[PDB]
Design a protein around this nucleic acid. Structure first.
Length: 56
RNA sequence: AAUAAAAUAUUACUUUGGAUAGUUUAGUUUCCUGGGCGAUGAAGAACGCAAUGAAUUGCGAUAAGUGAUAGGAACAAUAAAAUGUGAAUAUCCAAAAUUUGAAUGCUUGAAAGUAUACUAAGGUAUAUAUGAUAUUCAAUAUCCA
């Protein structure tokens, strides 16, 4: 057989097919654009960047 | 010999100190009833959440609280807004339940991370050992054409 090593044969490998859902959690994203940004920084240091550097 | 400054002695008032008396939402012991945790993720740990919070308490991205059921007019340190079209308050209930931790895809030091499959993100599942069933195999191990 031109080789000495014996390795485990490649038997068939079915994919997982659960009979009931593993979780009933609602499909809701808890990180949206309203929760990502809390509030703008309102310090005078942050207020100086708006006019010149065009940054918020 | 002499003076009473210091010294000494007693009482009253004051002070330093916190004894004594009165008091107790705290303990100790005995007894009665249970002894009701966890892969459906426990106990423990961390972080976060109050209009003004640092601790503590309560809670978990629905945050000092949501629904339902009882309950019936308060809360307060200050100001707000809501409220008999139901405020406080209570619960073996319902929803929701961050990161970890037996911790369980792999890694984990104070580590930031990262793979595959299913349903760009998000969410699930994938540790080790093990019982039953199904399926694909391996070994001439026993026969056997």
């Amino acid at each position: 057989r031109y080789t000495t090593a014996f390795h485990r044969p490649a038997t068939k490998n079915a994919a997982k097919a659960p009979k009931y859902p593993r979780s009933l959690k609602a499909n809701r994203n808890k990180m949206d654009e309203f929760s990502i940004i809390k509030f703008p920084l309102a310090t005078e240091t942050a207020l100086k960047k708006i006019e010149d550097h065009n940054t918020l």
